[PDB]
């Protein structure tokens, strides 16, 4: 469930190509990024890496946070997350974003929905559109490079 | 020429020479105006006036 | 008025650091990006605080409060002596407190901007907007409640 | 059909004037631009130069491009192209324009649409406003002042 687990071995792995090297769930931020683009920082709720959230509110003793969400409730999207702090990376919905997001359990063109926990669906209050076909990281794990830019 | 980029100093004279005119109208006019009709004027403040008005 | 005092005979009592920042001239917002888009148009009226649409006729256009489906940006800062109002666009988020209807909105709710440019509860709603807080009473009339507004919806 | 007028001028030109010399096919950019305005690029399929454009696919061979287009398939604004590597500068729908665009063959306060071709039209789901009138560069070829601010509801 962990976007970059510590575990030691007792041999070194050969790099052997420089292609297809991305495609791990450890590769956080967006693919291409600009210099003026918006970021925020949230208490994390769950683990909403890699998915839309959306803001939680609790009886008001603590401030707000982020949750994995979607649909009309949809805030931003979590491209980061920091374990030490608890911290959520979110990308607000008014900035653009382009990198890889976790996926319903599609080939490009294909218009990208938010589901009710974050993941990206097949179609649309939202602009997603993916940019490639779905890319199996576990059995239960399918990420997917999508474009987001905004609501529909 | 194919995208009309200068160098620095040719830009900076051009554009001070475009800002000198406009200052040369507002004296004389009193509005700031870029239309030749002189429509769409900036709203100044009062107590800001030129020779003819 | 942003700042209305002008002159007085004695120091208020502002000997506490808790619950300071809720005053009518804290310009700004409570959280703020350096990218952030920032533009200055002419304004009429008071648009302080408020949701603000475009009005054009010679002289050229200018903004002032109002709301709904003309809605394009929020005034968070004025200039009284240049009367220049500093606006964000709607295209990007904000968050900080603005001027509500009444003092019955409550934390979680959806809102709306009005004809004047004041935020009330919604379906209804053009444009995202969650309140943070409850309204706070600043004056008689006036009321301030803490805002996210994050870009538009889809559909009515 | 070229950013730069294809026909090289046969006079000096007299500007000792500075009002109305904007007008011209070749003001690229905006008219007021911020600095924290966010640029793309991309691949130009046909010539979307001061157009809206969308996201073109083809087999998979090659990337995405941008091609002229509207509708709910816009994506941006192309406010820029260089010829030589066939670059389209985009700015995004998510961020805010004001400058000339191409108009289709209209006053101030219009609210306006992009049509099949990314060109504006008067009236959907894109906030574009006019900010004068139409003016024509050639027979076929008209501009106005616009600013778009993103995606209506409904």
Redesign the interface.
């Known amino acids: 469930l962990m976007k970059n687990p510590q575990q030691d071995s007792g041999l070194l792995s050969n790099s052997i190509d420089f292609r297809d090297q991305n495609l791990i769930f450890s590769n956080s931020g967006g693919v291409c990024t600009s210099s003026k683009d918006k970021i925020e920082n949230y208490p994390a709720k769950g683990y909403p890496y890699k998915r839309g959230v959306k803001l939680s509110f609790g009886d008001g003793t603590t401030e707000l946070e982020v949750e994995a969400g979607g649909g009309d409730d949809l805030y931003g999207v979590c491209s980061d997350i920091d374990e030490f702090s608890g911290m959520a990376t979110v990308i607000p919905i008014t900035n653009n974003f382009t990198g890889y997001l976790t996926l319903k359990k599609v080939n490009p063109g294909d218009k990208l929905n938010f589901n009710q926990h974050g993941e990206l669906e097949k179609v649309k209050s939202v602009n997603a559109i993916a940019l490639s076909k779905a890319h199996k990281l576990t059995e239960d794990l399918f990420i997917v490079l999508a474009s987001v830019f905004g609501n529909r | 020429?194919?995208?009309?980029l200068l160098p620095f100093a040719q830009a900076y004279k051009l554009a001070s020479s475009?800002i000198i005119?406009?200052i040369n109208?507002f004296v004389l006019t009193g509005t700031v105006?870029?239309?030749?009709d002189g429509?769409?004027?900036?709203?100044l403040?009062p107590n800001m006036y030129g020779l003819l008005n | 008025m942003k700042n209305p005092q002008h002159d007085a005979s004695l120091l208020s009592n502002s000997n506490e650091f808790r619950d300071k920042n809720v005053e009518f001239f804290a310009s700004g917002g409570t959280r703020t990006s350096k990218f952030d888009k920032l533009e200055n148009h002419?304004f009429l009226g008071y648009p302080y605080k408020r949701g603000v649409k475009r009005v054009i006729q010679?002289?050229?256009p200018?903004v002032e409060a109002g709301g709904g489906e003309d809605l394009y940006g929020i005034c968070i800062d004025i200039d009284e002596?240049?009367?220049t109002a500093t606006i964000v666009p709607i295209t990007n988020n904000f968050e900080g407190y603005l001027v509500a209807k009444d003092s019955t909105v409550k934390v979680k709710d959806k809102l709306i901007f009005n004809k004047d440019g004041a935020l009330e509860k919604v379906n209804k709603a053009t444009i995202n907007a969650t309140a943070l807080t409850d309204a706070k009473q600043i004056s008689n009339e006036v009321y301030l409640v803490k805002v996210a507004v994050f870009g538009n919806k889809a559909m009515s």
Do not use: A, D, M, V
């Not at chain 2, 020429?1 to 009309?4: A, E, M, P």
């Open positions: 020429i194919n995208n009309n475009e005119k406009l109208h105006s870029i239309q030749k429509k769409n004027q900036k709203r403040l | 002419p010679h002289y050229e200018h002596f240049s009367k």
